Design a protein around this nucleic acid. Structure first.
Ligand SMILES: [Mg+2]
Ligand SMILES: [Mg+2]
Ligand SMILES: [Mg+2]
Ligand SMILES: [Mg+2]
Ligand SMILES: [Mg+2]
Ligand SMILES: [Mg+2]
Ligand SMILES: [Mg+2]
Ligand SMILES: [Mg+2]
Ligand SMILES: [Mg+2]
Ligand SMILES: [Mg+2]
Ligand SMILES: [Mg+2]
Ligand SMILES: [Mg+2]
Ligand SMILES: [Mg+2]
Ligand SMILES: [Mg+2]
Lengths: 127, 155, 92, 197, 106, 61
RNA sequence: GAAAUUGUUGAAAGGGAAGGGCAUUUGAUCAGACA
RNA sequence: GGAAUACUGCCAGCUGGGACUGAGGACUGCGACGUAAGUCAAGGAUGCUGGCAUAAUGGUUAUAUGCCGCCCGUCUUGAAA
RNA sequence: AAGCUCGUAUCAGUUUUAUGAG
RNA sequence: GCCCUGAAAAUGGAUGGCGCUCAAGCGUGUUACCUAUACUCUACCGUCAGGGUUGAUGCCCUGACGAGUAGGCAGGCGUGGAGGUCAGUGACGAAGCCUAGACCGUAAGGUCGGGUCGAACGGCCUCUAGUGCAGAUCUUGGUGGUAGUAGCAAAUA
RNA sequence: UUGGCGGAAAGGCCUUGGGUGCUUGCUGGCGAAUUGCAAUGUCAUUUUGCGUGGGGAUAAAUCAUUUGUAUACGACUUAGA
């Protein structure tokens, strides 16, 4: 029950991992560009890891879209939730990570009354 | 506020589609699919069995009969791309198949199916009995043997 | 195959034995019930909150060697939150 | 088309037979080769003996038990030619090589099985007449194989038994053909002849 | 009868490849009894199934199927190119596949 | 590949927008942009081009 | 109460290194859509 | 003496099988078939039907298989060397 | 990288023509 | 023209290997076939350019392009503190940390669930700087393999 | 069930007799359907699991002690109801 959209195509689903991050613990997986003049990764030899570039950019008609077809909007309270009262078919609300369970109950009740989709309705509310 | 509201929102009015220029025209069957032709079933529950093609239906399907008395295949629909048309042909002018169609075969035993099966199979057997060994041929099943090349076989 | 015996299969026999052993071990684990149930089953937690502490709390309420333990601090917090939820259920 | 293809190695050229067998094994066909001592290599006996002595020269200097292993049997020579054409250090190569059996003579149960030939590797079809060729059994005996006489005696005994079997089979076949010929004038025979059978 | 087979046998040879790089999206199939591209033109568009067995029963069966189809001929010796919904696992180089007679043009 | 005879991704420039943050100056720029687009007046073109100049390029009169 | 490093338990691989990329099989595990 | 055939080239001749793609989203345009209202393959796919409705497809993860893949930084033409 | 102008304006690792060198 | 001799050392090895003799060798001719990040068509990303338009440094249409060290221009991600604002989050659990779970970005990163934890902390518009590490035989601290290893054998017991 | 042969890795080949089923060599009579227009649509030997039961048989090795034809330690070679 979202806005009709074309099929969502991801050009590169795999994560871009930094070179030698699998080799050394001190090298994190956060992507860094290799600046070495003799780097085979920088020179793009066959068999090495892929590198991020603008060709992998996603379609503008499906960018920032969840698999259900909505754009995620963070909400912390009822006033934040009610900003999406008219944009129901395009935006889905996600409760912020630091919202307590007592306020999450109120947010879920208000979203159910307004017909607004909630991405994470089970959080902190186990029965 | 956990997230700032965006300035611009898309309109939620779903647009209509453009006027499609794709007209529905009737299917042109293969030239070897003539009513009364013996067909070999390639797939399904009755795979490998030989039936008789009777009528071309509106939903691009072929009406076929075993006949039910010979090999146990009732009045069914088959897909034209899942059969092999042989050179063997029987006369079908004595069979009245004007009743059967998509609404007849819609599933949403009635015994109307049984009565129609008997009525068709009487004329079918009457025509089949003129050719020797044809009834035994229809009761037998088809299968590929060792060394059989379908690209070289004649049907 | 080994150079000392070329007419006897070695790698294929090893693979066959390995496949058989893996299948037997997986079937034994399934019989012991150490694997998750089906998604549509009654005892499935699919789409729900997965918590070792909550599972242990409810199992102790219902009443081998394991590394899953529930602390008294977490147990008291679960009791307090359950009282809050019950009060809300009664008030609604 | 058979689950197991048994190849009579007599009269075949070793390299072409190895090529076709390696391709069949990689495609996934189970092959058993018999009578490897009757294989042929084109060229003169002293040429092929010289080549095998060059192979014998090849050996690891600091430890001879680590070097190339020089197997003297004719079936082992054929296996070396086949392993040179199969990428044997991979799992696929090992799986292909484990679909092959090579034997000297025709041991059981293959002594009662049908045996085929490969025309593209046969000496009488490939080599030009007048060209010299070598026999693998004689080459193996010259380079160190020690079981040529036992194989010959066992093959002679097998040939005696096979000749007796073939005499019985030929008598039965003549009887069957005589029984089939007397029904050639029947209407069923006429209809089958009209249909091509 | 003694036989119920309504398919032709084939062998999965390899992927489409050059000397030093393969393309798993396309598989090469050798169909039994086919020796020329002209003969292989009969089987273009036919469905192919790779049928294998697994120990764990799924949906009431231990038999699993990977579906694909013939696309074009390959070489001069009757080998054909095939594409599957999921690529063949490359452990099946030398394994058997079934080419069915549908969709039919006879 | 192709053998390029001209430089690729070459900017024309021509001082498309003013560098000032003055709201009233931007309103005048909008008005004369509309006038230059909808009148085909060389006077409007000249005034719009002059509205983009810098202080050192706009001496007092 | 992090990491390096270590113990126990469970799963897995291992015929003279391991690690990585593309693709799929197998085992385990999991989200969304459920009118 | 009269034909035929090969070869080469042309057709705004006809027709069968196979694969990949389906972007766009009221209408507007250029056309075609028609006395006509209308229709159309003409400014980008529609119509009919089935099974499933969940780990089935798919993602993650451990591994296996085919092929590819030298250890980074620095400095020196140049570095596995 | 900035300005002023011009914009059938300014031209060109080329050929042709005429005329030299060989 | 082809073939043989037309000089060769020293661990065991090389038309890349197997091997090949009316070749799988040499010379030539006719076809078919294999596959590059090349060419052709299509989709998508970005850049540039040309038009249209009374969230207008936005929207719509069209076309062509995309290698790169030193270096240049631009748009962004993240950190400590400061002004404003969300009458923002929080003992029905802030920050931190762990995570076989989930999503969004080409990426820098951002977001959600579960566990642990116990008191503070964030989004946006701006201001400010002791603001981002794999290297420097870098500094300080901590920890491995070596390894239950070398060794604990001068001075009579 | 009778007999013969087969040792290269025989483990298979031939054969006597009765019993018990089928036979499409030929002629008939019943049943098939709804797996819904396809979805391998599951079909072939062995079973380190059990229950039923009639029969068949009731060991050894190692540590420790001991010898020195042996020995760095393991190992080897001896002996002990
Ligand atoms: Mg503490
Ligand atoms: Mg640790
Ligand atoms: Mg999958
Ligand atoms: Mg490599
Ligand atoms: Mg070659
Ligand atoms: Mg040649
Ligand atoms: Mg380009
Ligand atoms: Mg917290
Ligand atoms: Mg600093
Ligand atoms: Mg550091
Ligand atoms: Mg650095
Ligand atoms: Mg240091
Ligand atoms: Mg010591
Ligand atoms: Mg002392």
């Amino acid at each position: 029950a979202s806005l009709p959209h074309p099929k969502i195509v991801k050009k590169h689903t795999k994560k871009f991992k930094r070179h030698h991050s699998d080799r050394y613990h001190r090298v994190a997986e956060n992507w860094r560009k290799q600046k070495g003049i003799d780097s085979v990764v920088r020179r793009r030899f066959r068999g090495n890891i892929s590198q991020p570039k603008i060709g992998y950019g996603s379609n503008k008609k499906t960018k920032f879209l969840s698999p259900s077809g909505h754009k995620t909007f963070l909400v912390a309270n009822v006033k934040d939730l009610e900003t999406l009262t008219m944009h129901t078919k395009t935006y889905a609300a996600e409760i912020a990570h630091n919202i307590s369970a007592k306020n999450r109950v109120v947010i879920l009740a208000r979203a159910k009354a307004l017909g607004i989709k909630v991405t994470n309705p089970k959080g902190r509310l186990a029965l | 506020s956990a997230q700032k509201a965006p300035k611009w929102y898309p309109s939620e009015d779903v647009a209509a589609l453009k006027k499609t220029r794709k007209a529905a025209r009737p299917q042109k069957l293969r030239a070897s699919l003539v009513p009364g032709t013996v067909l070999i079933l390639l797939a399904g529950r009755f795979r490998g069995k030989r039936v008789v093609y009777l009528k071309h239906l509106e939903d691009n399907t072929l009406l076929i009969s075993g006949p039910f008395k010979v090999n146990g295949v009732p009045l069914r629909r088959v897909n034209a791309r899942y059969v092999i048309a042989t050179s063997t042909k029987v006369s079908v002018e004595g069979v009245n198949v004007e009743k059967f169609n998509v609404e007849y075969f819609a599933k949403e035993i009635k015994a109307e199916r049984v009565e129609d099966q008997k009525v068709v199979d009487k004329a079918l057997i009457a025509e089949i009995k003129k050719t020797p060994l044809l009834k035994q041929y229809l009761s037998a099943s088809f299968s590929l043997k060792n060394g059989d090349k379908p690209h070289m076989l004649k049907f | 195959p080994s150079k000392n015996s070329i007419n006897r299969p070695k790698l294929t026999s090893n693979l066959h034995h390995k496949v058989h052993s893996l299948n037997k071990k997986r079937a034994q684990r399934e019989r012991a019930g150490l694997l998750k149930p089906a998604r549509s089953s009654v005892n499935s937690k699919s789409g729900e909150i997965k918590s070792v502490a909550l599972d242990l709390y409810f199992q102790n309420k219902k009443n081998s060697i394991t590394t899953r333990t529930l602390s008294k601090k977490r147990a008291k917090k679960i009791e307090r939150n359950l009282k809050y939820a019950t009060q809300r259920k009664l008030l609604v | 088309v058979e689950p197991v293809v048994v190849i009579d190695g007599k009269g075949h050229l070793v390299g072409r037979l190895a090529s076709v067998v390696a391709k069949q094994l990689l495609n996934g066909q189970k092959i058993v080769v018999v009578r490897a001592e009757e294989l042929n290599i084109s060229g003169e006996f002293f040429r092929n003996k010289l080549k095998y002595h060059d192979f014998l020269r090849k050996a690891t200097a600091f430890n001879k038990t680590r070097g190339p292993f020089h197997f003297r049997a004719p079936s082992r020579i054929f296996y070396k030619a086949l392993r040179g054409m199969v990428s044997h250090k991979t799992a696929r190569g090992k799986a292909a090589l484990e679909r092959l059996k090579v034997f000297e003579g025709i041991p059981p149960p293959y002594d009662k099985k049908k045996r085929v030939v490969v025309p593209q590797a046969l000496r009488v079809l490939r080599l030009k007449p007048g060209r010299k060729y070598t026999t693998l059994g004689k080459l193996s005996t010259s380079v160190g194989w020690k079981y040529e006489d036992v194989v010959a005696k066992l093959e002679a005994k097998r040939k005696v038994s096979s000749a007796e079997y073939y005499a019985k089979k030929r008598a039965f076949t003549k009887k069957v053909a005589s029984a089939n010929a007397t029904a050639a004038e029947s209407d069923v025979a006429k209809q089958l002849a009209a249909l091509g059978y | 009868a003694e036989s119920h087979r309504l398919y032709v046998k084939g062998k999965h040879l390899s992927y489409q490849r050059s000397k030093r790089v393969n393309n798993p999206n396309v598989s090469l199939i050798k169909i039994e009894g086919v020796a020329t591209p002209q003969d292989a033109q009969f089987y273009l568009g036919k469905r192919i199934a790779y049928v294998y067995r697994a120990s764990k029963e799924v949906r009431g069966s231990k038999i699993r199927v990977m579906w694909g189809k013939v696309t074009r001929t390959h070489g001069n010796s009757g080998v054909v190119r095939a594409t599957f919904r999921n690529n063949l696992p490359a452990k099946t180089f030398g394994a058997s596949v079934r080419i069915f007679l549908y969709p039919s043009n006879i | 590949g192709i053998d390029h005879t001209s430089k690729q991704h070459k900017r024309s420039g021509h001082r498309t927008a003013p560098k000032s943050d003055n709201v009233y100056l931007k309103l005048l720029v909008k008005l004369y942009t509309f006038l230059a687009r909808r009148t085909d007046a060389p006077f409007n073109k000249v005034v719009l081009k002059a509205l983009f100049l810098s202080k050192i390029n706009r001496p007092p009169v």
